[PDB]
Design an enzyme around this catalytic site. Structure first.
Site, PDB file in Angstrom:
ATOM      1  N   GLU A  23       0.805  -1.218   0.000  1.00 55.72           N
ATOM      2  CA  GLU A  23       0.000   0.000   0.000  1.00 55.72           C
ATOM      3  C   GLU A  23       0.844   1.277   0.000  1.00 55.72           C
ATOM      4  OE1 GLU A  23      -3.245   0.067   2.938  1.00 55.72           O
ATOM      5  OE2 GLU A  23      -3.119   2.258   2.849  1.00 55.72           O
ATOM      6  N   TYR A  24      -2.523   7.284  -1.344  1.00 53.25           N
ATOM      7  CA  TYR A  24      -3.448   7.413  -2.465  1.00 53.25           C
ATOM      8  C   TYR A  24      -3.217   6.309  -3.493  1.00 53.25           C
ATOM      9  CZ  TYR A  24       0.362   9.495  -5.263  1.00 53.25           C
ATOM     10  OH  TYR A  24       1.534   9.722  -5.950  1.00 53.25           O
ATOM     11  N   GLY A  25      -2.623   5.204  -3.044  1.00 54.91           N
ATOM     12  CA  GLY A  25      -2.270   4.117  -3.929  1.00 54.91           C
ATOM     13  C   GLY A  25      -2.390   2.769  -3.251  1.00 54.91           C
ATOM     14  N   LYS A  42      -0.698  -1.436  -9.835  1.00 54.46           N
ATOM     15  CA  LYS A  42      -0.864  -0.453  -8.773  1.00 54.46           C
ATOM     16  C   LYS A  42      -1.998   0.506  -9.112  1.00 54.46           C
ATOM     17  CE  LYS A  42       2.690   2.937 -10.080  1.00 54.46           C
ATOM     18  NZ  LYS A  42       3.762   3.780  -9.471  1.00 54.46           N
ATOM     19  N   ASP A 137      15.076  10.296  -6.253  1.00 61.12           N
ATOM     20  CA  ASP A 137      14.581   9.589  -5.076  1.00 61.12           C
ATOM     21  C   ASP A 137      15.049   8.139  -5.078  1.00 61.12           C
ATOM     22  OD1 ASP A 137      13.377   9.715  -2.618  1.00 61.12           O
ATOM     23  OD2 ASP A 137      11.393   9.110  -3.357  1.00 61.12           O
TER      24      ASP A 137
HETATM   25  N1  LIG Z   1       3.280   1.400  -4.195  1.00 59.96           N
HETATM   26  N2  LIG Z   1       3.589   0.587  -3.192  1.00 59.96           N
HETATM   27  N3  LIG Z   1       3.908  -0.156  -2.207  1.00 59.96           N
HETATM   28  C1  LIG Z   1       3.436  -1.525  -2.078  1.00 59.96           C
HETATM   29  C2  LIG Z   1       4.454  -2.553  -2.645  1.00 59.96           C
HETATM   30  O1  LIG Z   1       4.576  -2.413  -4.012  1.00 59.96           O
HETATM   31  C3  LIG Z   1       5.551  -3.307  -4.308  1.00 59.96           C
HETATM   32  N4  LIG Z   1       5.674  -3.252  -5.714  1.00 59.96           N
HETATM   33  C4  LIG Z   1       5.699  -2.187  -6.459  1.00 59.96           C
HETATM   34  S1  LIG Z   1       5.633  -0.574  -5.826  1.00 59.96           S
HETATM   35  C5  LIG Z   1       6.219   0.389  -7.217  1.00 59.96           C
HETATM   36  C6  LIG Z   1       6.214   1.863  -6.871  1.00 59.96           C
HETATM   37  O2  LIG Z   1       6.627   2.160  -5.743  1.00 59.96           O
HETATM   38  O3  LIG Z   1       5.819   2.655  -7.749  1.00 59.96           O
HETATM   39  N5  LIG Z   1       5.806  -2.538  -7.704  1.00 59.96           N
HETATM   40  C7  LIG Z   1       5.832  -3.843  -7.759  1.00 59.96           C
HETATM   41  C8  LIG Z   1       5.916  -4.793  -8.751  1.00 59.96           C
HETATM   42  N6  LIG Z   1       6.006  -4.493 -10.008  1.00 59.96           N
HETATM   43  N7  LIG Z   1       5.925  -6.064  -8.412  1.00 59.96           N
HETATM   44  C9  LIG Z   1       5.843  -6.442  -7.185  1.00 59.96           C
HETATM   45  N8  LIG Z   1       5.749  -5.573  -6.243  1.00 59.96           N
HETATM   46  C10 LIG Z   1       5.745  -4.284  -6.489  1.00 59.96           C
HETATM   47  C11 LIG Z   1       6.667  -2.755  -3.463  1.00 59.96           C
HETATM   48  O4  LIG Z   1       7.546  -3.801  -3.270  1.00 59.96           O
HETATM   49  C12 LIG Z   1       5.904  -2.515  -2.176  1.00 59.96           C
HETATM   50  O5  LIG Z   1       6.080  -3.636  -1.363  1.00 59.96           O
END
Ligand SMILES: N=[N+]=NC[C@H]1O[C@@H](n2c(SCC(=O)O)nc3c(N)ncnc32)[C@H](O)[C@@H]1O
Length: 336
Positions: A23, A24-25, A42, A137
């Site tokens: 986990e 606005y997303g 996402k 970042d």
């Molecule tokens: N948002 N958020 N947080 C929740 C979780 O998303 C996980 N995760 C993201 S997040 C990409 C981003 O940050 O834009 N992409 C991916 C992906 N392709 N495959 C697997 N896992 C993902 C990240 O490991 C965190 O545990």
């Protein structure tokens, strides 16, 4: 519509059998009935806050233009067919097993893994900077890994176009990027509009791969600098004289003399070649700090360094309502 922990996921029919990830997303995995593989999706709900709209437009615009093995791609984007009906945006990506932040919580990396991870970070960052873009970042949680340890940089929400002619600012100017990974010039006289600020964060990432602990875990704005100076030591006369801002220079001059801590005393198990490159990324003076192409040619990366296999970009590079309009326009190609 399938649901997961309260909120809903309007990703059907192509994507089924969802599973929560994080986990606005919000991020989940899903089965891609078209390609017969599980993927990552996402959900983004950003349109009421403009700063969210900014991050969303930057991320979408950049990632749609970038194509690189070490940068997460966008495979698909799901959203309502009209602006009026668009509340959420869904970004579909290759499914990754973990990220480096989660992996570092429990796993000790071998020197082979550290070397392989660093190479992949810099190979991807080479592409980013070739596009005249700064990530701004970089940190372990923005580096995704799959089950065969392939690494992909993600989250470009703070990324912008390099602008070194406008990088100078006053002492103690406000900043947004993640504190533990901010270069020292951010707190002194820099807006972070040059490529050197990314290299500093990568240096911080290498140090964290070496010990499973952040090297500069500052607790507040100026405390970040105290951590950095406590290890690097007092800046030389030459580095100080490059800081013309009087407030920033007189702050540094007001500090007692401090000695540099040797990297091999901080990381006694590390490979000496890794520590040499570490020192060159974590250089105080940003004009002397190593650049990404120099880092790739460092002896530490000799097993992998192949400049003809490290490609560069072909094409280098406002209120809430216009930004939502631009996000709608930017995502039209996946409709539907
Ligand atoms: N948002 N958020 N947080 C929740 C979780 O998303 C996980 N995760 C993201 S997040 C990409 C981003 O940050 O834009 N992409 C991916 C992906 N392709 N495959 C697997 N896992 C993902 C990240 O490991 C965190 O545990």
């Amino acid at each position: 519509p399938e649901m997961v922990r309260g909120q809903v996921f309007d990703v059907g029919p192509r994507y089924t059998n969802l599973s929560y990830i994080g986990e606005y997303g919000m991020v989940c995995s899903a089965y891609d009935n078209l390609n017969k593989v599980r993927v990552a999706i996402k959900k983004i709900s950003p349109f009421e806050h403009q700063t969210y709209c900014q991050r969303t437009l930057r991320e979408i615009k950049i990632l749609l233009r970038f194509r690189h093995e070490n940068i997460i791609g966008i495979n698909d984007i799901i959203r309502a067919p009209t602006i009026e009906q668009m509340k959420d945006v869904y970004i579909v990506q290759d499914l990754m097993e973990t990220d480096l932040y989660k992996l570092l919580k429990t796993q000790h990396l071998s020197n082979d893994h550290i070397c392989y991870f660093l190479y992949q970070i810099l190979r991807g960052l080479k592409y980013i900077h070739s596009a005249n873009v700064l990530h701004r970042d970089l940190k372990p949680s923005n580096l995704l890994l799959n089950t065969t340890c392939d690494l992909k940089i993600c989250d470009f929400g703070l990324a912008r176009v390099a602008d070194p002619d406008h990088d100078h600012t006053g002492f103690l100017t406000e900043y947004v990027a993640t504190r533990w990974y901010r270069a020292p010039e951010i707190m002194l006289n820099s807006k972070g509009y040059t490529k050197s600020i990314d290299i500093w964060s990568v240096g911080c990432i290498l140090a964290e791969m070496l010990s499973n602990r952040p090297i500069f875990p500052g607790k507040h704005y100026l405390d970040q600098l105290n951590h950095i100076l406590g290890i690097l030591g007092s800046p030389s006369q030459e580095d100080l004289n490059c800081i013309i801002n009087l407030k920033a220079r007189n702050y540094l001059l007001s500090l007692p003399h401090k000695n540099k801590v040797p990297w091999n005393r901080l990381f006694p198990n590390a490979d000496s070649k890794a520590l040499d490159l570490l020192d060159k990324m974590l250089t105080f003076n940003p004009h002397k700090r190593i650049e990404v192409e120099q880092a790739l040619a460092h002896p530490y990366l000799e097993q992998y360094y192949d400049p003809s296999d490290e490609p560069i970009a072909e094409a280098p590079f406002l209120p809430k309502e216009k930004l939502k309009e631009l996000i709608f326009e930017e995502t039209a190609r996946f409709q539907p």
